Amino acid sequence: AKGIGIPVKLLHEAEGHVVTVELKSGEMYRGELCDAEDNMNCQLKDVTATGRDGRVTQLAHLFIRGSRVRFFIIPDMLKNAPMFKRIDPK
């Protein structure tokens, strides 16, 4: 909406896909994001937890606080978002 920057609407249109979440603590979280917040709080499902020691754990759902999160890994499929193409020089 008016006021909102592009990459969070990127995050929103990433909905319904399987992505990865790195938080500032260093562990990795792979799962299907259900929906996310303006404040980057997000809910994934089918959760793979990769702990700081390589620990692999199975979590049904995850709600991740955004200001806890470092970055997101998102399919380049979705890097075809209309913002990406529209801004593009060609």
Partner: protein, 99 residues
């Protein structure tokens, strides 16, 4: 911002924990969020004497990544961006002569 001059331009990022992220620029948010295409994590391992600092920084390939400004500390450039006819005629004519 002047980092509008910087979309599509390949760049490197430092995190607070000093981990390195190299990717190309797609979109930027006011919160210093960034969109990195073709991103890879270079994490500095401790330098074990007898080897170059340049030859064993652990590279992981992250793919497409997006960066929250809160832990974004420093950004630099890495490289460049990767890769009426008019009313004229000409006709053959002899030159006329007066005699």
């Amino acid at each position: 911002s002047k980092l509008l001059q910087y979309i599509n331009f390949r760049m490197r990022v430092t995190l607070v924990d000093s981990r390195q992220i190299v990717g190309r620029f797609m979109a930027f948010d006011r919160h210093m969020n960034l969109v990195l295409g073709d991103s890879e994590e270079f994490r500095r391992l401790p330098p074990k004497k007898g080897k170059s600092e340049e030859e064993r920084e652990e590279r992981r390939v992250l793919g497409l990544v997006l960066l929250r400004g809160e832990e974004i500390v420093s950004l630099t450039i890495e490289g460049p961006p990767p890769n009426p006819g008019g009313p004229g005629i000409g006709r053959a004519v002899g030159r006329g002569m007066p005699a």
